[PDB]
Design a protein around this ligand. Sequence first.
Ligand SMILES: [Mg+2]
Ligand SMILES: [Mg+2]
Ligand SMILES: [Mg+2]
Ligand SMILES: [Mg+2]
Ligand SMILES: [Mg+2]
Ligand SMILES: [Mg+2]
Ligand SMILES: [Mg+2]
Ligand SMILES: [Mg+2]
Ligand SMILES: [Mg+2]
Ligand SMILES: [Mg+2]
Ligand SMILES: [Mg+2]
Ligand SMILES: [Mg+2]
Ligand SMILES: [Mg+2]
Ligand SMILES: [Mg+2]
Ligand SMILES: [Mg+2]
Ligand SMILES: [Mg+2]
Ligand SMILES: [Mg+2]
Ligand SMILES: [Mg+2]
Ligand SMILES: [Mg+2]
Ligand SMILES: [Mg+2]
Ligand SMILES: [Mg+2]
Ligand SMILES: [Mg+2]
Ligand SMILES: [Mg+2]
Ligand SMILES: [Mg+2]
Ligand SMILES: [Mg+2]
Ligand SMILES: [Mg+2]
Ligand SMILES: [Mg+2]
Ligand SMILES: [Mg+2]
Ligand SMILES: [Mg+2]
Ligand SMILES: [Mg+2]
Ligand SMILES: [Mg+2]
Ligand SMILES: [Mg+2]
Ligand SMILES: [Mg+2]
Ligand SMILES: [Mg+2]
Ligand SMILES: [Mg+2]
Ligand SMILES: [Mg+2]
Ligand SMILES: [Mg+2]
Ligand SMILES: [Mg+2]
Ligand SMILES: [Mg+2]
Ligand SMILES: [Mg+2]
Ligand SMILES: [Mg+2]
Ligand SMILES: [Mg+2]
Ligand SMILES: [Mg+2]
Ligand SMILES: [Mg+2]
Ligand SMILES: [Mg+2]
Ligand SMILES: [Mg+2]
Ligand SMILES: [Mg+2]
Ligand SMILES: [Mg+2]
Ligand SMILES: [Mg+2]
Ligand SMILES: [Mg+2]
Ligand SMILES: [Mg+2]
Ligand SMILES: [Mg+2]
Ligand SMILES: [Zn+2]
Lengths: 275, 65, 96, 115, 88
Amino acid sequence: GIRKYKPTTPGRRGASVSDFAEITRSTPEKSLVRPLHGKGGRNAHGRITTRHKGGGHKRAYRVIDFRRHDKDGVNAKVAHIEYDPNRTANIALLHYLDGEKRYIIAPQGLKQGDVIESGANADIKPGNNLPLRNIPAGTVIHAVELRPGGGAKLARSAGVSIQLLGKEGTYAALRMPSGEIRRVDVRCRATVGEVGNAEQSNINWGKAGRMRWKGKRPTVRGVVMNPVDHPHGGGEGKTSGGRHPVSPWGKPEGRTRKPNKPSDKLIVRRRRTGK
Amino acid sequence: TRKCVFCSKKGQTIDYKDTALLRTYISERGKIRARRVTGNCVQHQRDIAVAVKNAREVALLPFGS
Amino acid sequence: MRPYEIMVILDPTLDERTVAPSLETFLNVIRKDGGTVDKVDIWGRRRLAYEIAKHAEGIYAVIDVKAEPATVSELDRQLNLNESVLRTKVLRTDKH
Amino acid sequence: KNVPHGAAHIKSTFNNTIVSITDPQGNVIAWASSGHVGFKGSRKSTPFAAQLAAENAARKAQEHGVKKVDVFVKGPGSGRETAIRSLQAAGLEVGTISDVTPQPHNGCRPPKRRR
Amino acid sequence: ALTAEQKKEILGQYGLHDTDTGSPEAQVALLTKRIQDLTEHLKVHKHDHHSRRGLLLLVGRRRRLLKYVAQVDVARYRSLIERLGLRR
RNA sequence: GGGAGACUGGAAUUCCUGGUGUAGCGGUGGAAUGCGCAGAUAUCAGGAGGAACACCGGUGGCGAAGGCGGGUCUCUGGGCAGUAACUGACGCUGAGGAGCGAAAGCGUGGGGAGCGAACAGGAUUAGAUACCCUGGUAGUCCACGCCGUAAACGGUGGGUACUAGGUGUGGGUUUCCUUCCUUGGGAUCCGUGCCGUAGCUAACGCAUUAAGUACCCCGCCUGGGGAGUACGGCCGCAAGG
Ligand SMILES: [Mg+2]
Ligand SMILES: [Mg+2]
Ligand SMILES: [Mg+2]
Ligand SMILES: [Mg+2]
Ligand SMILES: [Mg+2]
Ligand SMILES: [Mg+2]
Ligand SMILES: [Mg+2]
Ligand SMILES: [Mg+2]
Ligand SMILES: [Mg+2]
Ligand SMILES: [Mg+2]
Ligand SMILES: [Mg+2]
Ligand SMILES: [Mg+2]
Ligand SMILES: [Mg+2]
Ligand SMILES: [Mg+2]
Ligand SMILES: [Mg+2]
Ligand SMILES: [Mg+2]
Ligand SMILES: [Mg+2]
Ligand SMILES: [Mg+2]
Ligand SMILES: [Mg+2]
Ligand SMILES: [Mg+2]
Ligand SMILES: [Mg+2]
Ligand SMILES: [Mg+2]
Ligand SMILES: [Mg+2]
Ligand SMILES: [Mg+2]
Ligand SMILES: [Mg+2]
Ligand SMILES: [Mg+2]
Ligand SMILES: [Mg+2]
Ligand SMILES: [Mg+2]
Ligand SMILES: [Mg+2]
Ligand SMILES: [Mg+2]
Ligand SMILES: [Mg+2]
Ligand SMILES: [Mg+2]
Ligand SMILES: [Mg+2]
Ligand SMILES: [Mg+2]
Ligand SMILES: [Mg+2]
Ligand SMILES: [Mg+2]
Ligand SMILES: [Mg+2]
Ligand SMILES: [Mg+2]
Ligand SMILES: [Mg+2]
Ligand SMILES: [Mg+2]
Ligand SMILES: [Mg+2]
Ligand SMILES: [Mg+2]
Ligand SMILES: [Mg+2]
Ligand SMILES: [Mg+2]
Ligand SMILES: [Mg+2]
Ligand SMILES: [Mg+2]
Ligand SMILES: [Mg+2]
Ligand SMILES: [Mg+2]
Ligand SMILES: [Mg+2]
Ligand SMILES: [Mg+2]
Ligand SMILES: [Mg+2]
Ligand SMILES: [Mg+2]
Ligand SMILES: [Zn+2]
C-alpha cells in the first residue's frame, strides 16, 4: 500500500513511497535483458532535443510482450510479479506451456497463481488479451491496440484505462481517460481489467536526488531567465514578463493538434477539461 | 374494511409467478393501491408488494404506463 | 445444498427448439460439480411491458435448482456474459 | 403538406400553457402559445389565454388539413379541461385522452421551499 | 452462524457427557468457534460496526463465563485454557 | 428498512447529436437582468453521465443510540414463543479508561446530473451588504483518515418486583362453536399507538411502555450576568473540542 517515512532528516521529512509488497523476485531474468543506456535527453546528433531531462541513473531494458499475438491456445501461470522501473506499472513474468517466457503488463490485483489465456477462448479474468469479437461491451480494458495485429500502443495508464462502450458495424467505440470517445476497429487487440499500481499516484517525491535519478533536470523559470534567452527574461525585481506566457521556443499557449490525421476521422470530439 | 383473502389456508400461495393475482391488485395506470382501499392484510400486502414489484422488475407488469 | 429459483429471458431471435439444448449445456456445469437435481419448464412469446435492449418480446424459462452458492454464482457469471440473454435473477426457495 | 391523423400536445404550468399539434411519428405541424397570442405576465396564465392558444392551434392545423387528433396532457393543473373543451369545440374530434405527467422517482432534488 | 452438523459435533466432542449441552465447556466452545469464524469474516469486511457490537458482547459474555470457571475450579479452568491454547 | 460488499432495473433532470417546426421562451404581487432570430421554446429518435428510489409507506418494523427502506446474491448480529435437557450465585449498575456516533468542516486522490453557502447583476424600500428573480464557486457523491459536538427530546439512566381497564397494530404458540372457510370465540408472551382510575405533581400533565409505591448503582444542579469565557492541562494538521 502506502507507507510514510518518518522525518529522520530535514530533507526526507515529506518523502512517502508506495511500498512494493507486490514483489516476488529481485534479480531480473538475464536472458531477456537488452543493452540500453540513458540517452541524456540528446539525440545521436549531439544537440539537446528536450531540456529539463537527462542524466541520472543508467538502467537496463527488457522486451515486453505488448502485442501478444504469436502464440494462442496455451495457458500460462503467473511466474513472478517483479518490478520494472522503466514503467509506472509492474511486469509479471509468465511460464507458458511451450516454455517461452515473455514479460507482460501486470494488471490490477494480479497475484501469483492465476492461469492466463491469450486468444479467442480466453475468459474475462484480467491479463487475457483477445480481439473485440470476444469481449462484452462495457468492460474495462487496457493495453489496447489500433489494428488487427500491428502491435498495441494505448491504454496502459496505472489506475485508469480505456473503457469499451459499444460495437456498431465494423468499428468499435472506446472511452478515453480524459472522457473522450475514439472509433477503432472491431478486430483490434485489447486486454481485460485495469492496470495495477493505482496507489502510485499517492507517491510523494521527496527531494532532488530521487529526481535526477528518475531523469528530469531542474526547471529554470523564465521570469529570472535572461531576456535574450527567453521572452520572459529581464527585469529588475520579480516581473511576469509583461505579456502572456509563451514557450521560449516561439509559440504561446493554444491549439497544437494538427488535424487531418488518418484517425482524425476516427475521433468524434476532443477532450474537455475541468467539467 | 373488507376481508383479507390470503389469511385463508384455502387461499393460493403468493408469488411473482401468478400474473392473475398480480394484476388483480394493480391499477390500470400500473399502480399498487392502499390497505384502506383493498381491505387486505399488512404482511400479506408486503408479500404482494415484493412479488409484484419483482415481476415489474422482471418486466411482467408495466412501470406506470 | 439449498433450493434456488432461477428465471432466464432469451432474445426472441432464437427459435424455441434451441432453448432446451442451450439451457442444459449451461447447467451441465452444476450437474457435474455438486450432483444436483433440477426441474425445467418453458413458456415463451409474451408481450413485454416495455422495450428492453430495443426488443419487444421474449421467451421465459424457469428452473428450480438445488445446488451450491458457488455453482449458482458460476452459472450467473457464465450466463449473463452471453449476448443472447436479456435479464436473469436467482432467489431462495426456502424461508430466506 | 397533408396528414390524416395528428396528435395534440398540451402542457400547463402555474404561469404558462403552450399547445403544439404533431404527427403520431412526432413530426410537428403547428404550435401556439398565449405569449404569441399577446398576453403579458400572469395574464398569460389565465384559462382564457389557453382558449385563445387552443383555437389558434386548431385553426393553423385545419389549414394544414388534420381531421383526427389525440391529446396528451402534462404539468400542474391550470386549464386542462377548459383547453380540451376549446379544442373540441373548435371543430376537431378527439379519440383518446392520456395524462402523461413527468413524475420523478425521487430523482435529483427539488428546489428549496418557498417562504 | 454455526449450524446443526458442526454444532452438535462440537457440543458432543467437548461435552462432559453425551447429553449435556449447557455446560460451561460447551458454551465456551461455541463462543470461541463463533468468534474465530466471524473474526475471519470481519478480516475481509471492515466497517461492520453492528457486527463488531456482537463481537464485543460475545467477548464480554465469554469473559464472564471464563471468570466463573476460574472461580469455581482452578483445575478445570487451566485444563480448558490449555486445551484451547488461549492466553486468558 | 439490522449491517457490509458486489451485480442489476425503471422514471425524471441536464447535456450532446439528427429531423420537424416557427418568433418568442423562462420568470414574479408587476417587470428587468437570462437564452433566441447564428434558429430558442416545443416535439420525436438515439446516446452519455451523476444523484436518489415516487406508489407499498402508516403515528407500522428493526437497531443500544445516531439512524435505517428499487430488486438479486454472498456472510453475519440482535430479539421472540413453546420442550423446559444441562451449568448450578455466573446477576445488576459501573468512577477513572476504552469503542461507536446527525449534519457541517479539514487532508490526499477521483467523481460531480440536480440542488446549493459565498459572489455578480436585475427588483423593492428614504435605505437592503436580506426576504424575490437570473447565474453559479466550495460542499452535496466515492475511498482512506480525521473533529466529536445537536431542542443527540420521551427535554425523563439502566435493571428488577407489585398496583384497576377500555380501544387498534405486529410476531408466535394453543384450544373450542367448528363450516373446521371466519379480525369466529378463548388462553398465553413480546413490541408498539390513544383515552382513562386510585396515586403523584405548583400547574400543564404522567398514569403497567408511570413523573405510582420501592430496591441497587452512576452522572448532573445549588439566584441571574460575568462565562461555557481567560489562564493552565489533554486531543486534534487546523477550524476547533
Ligand atoms: Mg518535504
Ligand atoms: Mg535492453
Ligand atoms: Mg550538422
Ligand atoms: Mg521540464
Ligand atoms: Mg553521468
Ligand atoms: Mg514502478
Ligand atoms: Mg520555471
Ligand atoms: Mg536567471
Ligand atoms: Mg527576444
Ligand atoms: Mg547563448
Ligand atoms: Mg529580470
Ligand atoms: Mg517593481
Ligand atoms: Mg496566452
Ligand atoms: Mg480527451
Ligand atoms: Mg410473508
Ligand atoms: Mg404563478
Ligand atoms: Mg423555483
Ligand atoms: Mg441468524
Ligand atoms: Mg463497505
Ligand atoms: Mg436534436
Ligand atoms: Mg429535446
Ligand atoms: Mg457529471
Ligand atoms: Mg435434572
Ligand atoms: Mg445483562
Ligand atoms: Mg457493570
Ligand atoms: Mg460493571
Ligand atoms: Mg470512573
Ligand atoms: Mg465514567
Ligand atoms: Mg478508537
Ligand atoms: Mg478510534
Ligand atoms: Mg449532508
Ligand atoms: Mg458527512
Ligand atoms: Mg474549510
Ligand atoms: Mg477529505
Ligand atoms: Mg479532492
Ligand atoms: Mg444553482
Ligand atoms: Mg439561494
Ligand atoms: Mg462575470
Ligand atoms: Mg446580491
Ligand atoms: Mg451537550
Ligand atoms: Mg435521534
Ligand atoms: Mg440515557
Ligand atoms: Mg429502574
Ligand atoms: Mg402486555
Ligand atoms: Mg384519586
Ligand atoms: Mg393535588
Ligand atoms: Mg391514565
Ligand atoms: Mg414503568
Ligand atoms: Mg420525580
Ligand atoms: Mg452579554
Ligand atoms: Mg455558565
Ligand atoms: Mg491553557
Ligand atoms: Zn392477511
